[PDB]
Nucleic acid binder design. Structure first.
Lengths: 55, 46, 110, 102
RNA sequence: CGAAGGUGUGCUGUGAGGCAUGCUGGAGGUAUCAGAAGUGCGAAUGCUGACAUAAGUAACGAUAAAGCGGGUGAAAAGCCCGCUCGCCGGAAGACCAAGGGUUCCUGUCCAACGUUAAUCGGGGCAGGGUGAGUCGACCCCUAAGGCGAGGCCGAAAGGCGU
RNA sequence: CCCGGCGAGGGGAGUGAAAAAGAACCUGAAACCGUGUACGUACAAGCAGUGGGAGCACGCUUAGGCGUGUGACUGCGUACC
C-alpha cells in the first residue's frame, strides 16, 4: 500500500506539531556543599542530603 | 551453491595465453586488433 | 555588541539538532548552560560547545561581562550529504544518504 | 643576446615604484628580474626547530617583469634603449641616444 | 566616472516585445541598412545532473548468555588485567593442497571504512620479518592427448600423418 | 593571541584594490530547507480562482486624497495534453 498523491509541507508540519521536547522544571541545592543536582539523585562530588556517600 | 567461475592458472594460460594466441592465424588477428586499439594489457599472462 | 560562533560540517541531521536548539532561544547564558547539562541527547554536547566558544569570544575580543549576556539568535542549516551503497535482496542495490549541518549561535548584551 | 644583465643599473618604468633605481641581483628564466630595494613584500614566516630559525614577519624582494625596467644612462640622467654591434671581432652593446658603448 | 550576465522598481505598444533607472559584477558590447541559420519546448513509460515524498517509519544478518572489581583515557556495555557463568569438542580443535598476495610482527593516528560508541581493527602512516646436498620445484621416464622435417591430400586459407 | 581532545570547527590581528577572492577559492539562476516582522486562521464542507467588499498595519500628503501588504463575509465556478 502506497500513496496516490504527494503530501504537502503543511501536512508535514501538522503531524510534527507534537514533537517538542520538555526541559527540567528546576534543580535542587545540597544543604552542605551548595551544588545543584537532579532531585532524588546524588551530586557530582558524592553528596546526598548533606552527607558524603562516595569517595 | 556452486557458481560458474572456478579458477586454475594452468588452464587459464593454456586457454588464453600469449603463445596460444601466436599458434594460430586468427589469434594473431586478435593481437593486431588489440595493439591497434592501444591496450595496456595484451593477454592474460603476467 | 553581538558575537558569533559556528560549527560547520557537523555529523548530524538538522531535524535532530533543531529539537535541542529550540530549548534555549532567548534565555540567559547561565540558565541555558544549566538546561543543556541535563538533556540526554547527542546534539546537546555539540550545541553546548558552540555556546561556550561564543562566550569566550565575547570575553576576549570585545570586553563583555558574562552576567549581562543573552542568547539573541540561534539557527541550524543543512550541509552537504555523503552517498553510499547498501545491498538488498535478489541482487538489488539501494542508496544511503549521510547528512550534515551547520550550527550558528549569536550572543548579545542588549 | 640579452639586453639586461646581472650587475646592471636600471630605472623602473611601470608600477608602484615608478621612478626608482637599483641594481640587478639575478635573472630568472621566466623573464623576470630581482632588483635591490624594489618591489618589497611582507611574508608571515612560521618557525622551525630544525636549522635554529624562529618565525616572524619579514620584508623581502619579489620578482618584476623584465620589460618594465630600463638601462640608466648616467651621462644624460635618463632611460635608454640598447643596440648590438661588432667592434674588433666581438659583440658589444651600445646606447641608442648618443651611440656610445656600454 | 563601470561592459556582458544576475536581482528589483517605474513607464510604454493590439501581440510576440521595448525603453529608463537602484543594488550585485569586474571587461567587454555594438546602432542603421542588408546577408546566412545547429533559430523559440510542458508533455514522446524522452536523455544527463541535482533535490523532494512516504519518515525520523521498517530494519541493524542464526534465541550459544552474561555479572562484577581495577587500568588507561576528553569520554568505556563492546579495549587491557583478574574472578565467576555459559557454548563446541569425528569440531565451532591442529596441519596442508588449490586459490589469494603482505592480510604476518612492533610503534603511532581515529577524518572516511566497521550496519551503534570506539582509547580497538584484516582501516591510514612508517619501520622490521621468509637462511636447505637430505622438504618441494627445476631435472631423468613415459599415459590420454598436442605439435610435427620429408610425405599424402585440398580454389586460396588450410586437413591428416612418419 | 583566544575557546576546543597538543582535535574537527570557529573568533580577532595581519596581507591585498577586493577575503560573502581563504584553497569545498571568477560570476553564483531554479527546484528544495530555515530565522525575523505585518495581517489572517480552532461551528467549518469540494480544481483553491474570479466579481463585490468591511476591518487592521504601514508610506507620501496640497489635511483633499492616493499608493503598497493582508483579507472576515457573499454571487459564479468539476485541471492540462
Amino acid at each position: 500500500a502506497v500513496q496516490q498523491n504527494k503530501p504537502t509541507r503543511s501536512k508535514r508540519g501538522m503531524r510534527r506539531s507534537h514533537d517538542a521536547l520538555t526541559a527540567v522544571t528546576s534543580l535542587s541545592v545540597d544543604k552542605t556543599s551548595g551544588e545543584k543536582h537532579l532531585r532524588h539523585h546524588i551530586t557530582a562530588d558524592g553528596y546526598y542530603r548533606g552527607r558524603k556517600v562516595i569517595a | 551453491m556452486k557458481r560458474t567461475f572456478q579458477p586454475s592458472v594452468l588452464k587459464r594460460n593454456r586457454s588464453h595465453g600469449f603463445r596460444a594466441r601466436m599458434a594460430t592465424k586468427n589469434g594473431r588477428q586478435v593481437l593486431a586488433r588489440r595493439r591497434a586499439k592501444g591496450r595496456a594489457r595484451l593477454t592474460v599472462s603476467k | 555588541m553581538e558575537t558569533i560562533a559556528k560549527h560547520r560540517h557537523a555529523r548530524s541531521s538538522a531535524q535532530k539538532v533543531r529539537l535541542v536548539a529550540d530549548l534555549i532561544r532567548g534565555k540567559k547564558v547561565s540558565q541555558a548552560l544549566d538546561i543543556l547539562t541535563y538533556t540526554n541527547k547527542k546534539a546537546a554536547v555539540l550545541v553546548k560547545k558552540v555556546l561556550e566558544s561564543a562566550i569566550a569570544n565575547a570575553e576576549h575580543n570585545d570586553g563583555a561581562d558574562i552576567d549581562d549576556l543573552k542568547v539573541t539568535k540561534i539557527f541550524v542549516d543543512e550541509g552537504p550529504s555523503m552517498k553510499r551503497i547498501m545491498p538488498r535482496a535478489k541482487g538489488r542495490a539501494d542508496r544511503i544518504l549521510k547528512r550534515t549541518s551547520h550550527i550558528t549561535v549569536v550572543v548579545s548584551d542588549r | 643576446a640579452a639586453k639586461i644583465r646581472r650587475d646592471d643599473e636600471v630605472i623602473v618604468l611601470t608600477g608602484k615604484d615608478k621612478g626608482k633605481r637599483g641594481k640587478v641581483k639575478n635573472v630568472l628564466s621566466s623573464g623576470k628580474v630581482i632588483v635591490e630595494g624594489i618591489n618589497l613584500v611582507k611574508k608571515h614566516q612560521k618557525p622551525v626547530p630544525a636549522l635554529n630559525q624562529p618565525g616572524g614577519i619579514v620584508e623581502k624582494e619579489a620578482a618584476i617583469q623584465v620589460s618594465n625596467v630600463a638601462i640608466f644612462n648616467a651621462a644624460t640622467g635618463k632611460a635608454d634603449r640598447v643596440g648590438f654591434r661588432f667592434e674588433d671581432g666581438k659583440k658589444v652593446r651600445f646606447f641608442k641616444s648618443n651611440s656610445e658603448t656600454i
